[PDB]
Design a protein around this ligand. Sequence first.
Ligand SMILES: [Fe+3]
Length: 52
Amino acid sequence: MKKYVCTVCGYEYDPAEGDPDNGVKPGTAFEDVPADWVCPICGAPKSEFEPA
Ligand SMILES: [Fe+3]
């Protein structure tokens, strides 16, 4: 799918690996990531990401 970048710190969300530690299964499109999911490294909200 499409990777998304955290505009605050550069952390990249990769659909291919999801975020298992938070129940985000691999294959999860960023659009489908939980609304309250935040960037693992800076805490920024989903609204602060940008399609890469
Ligand atoms: Fe971040």
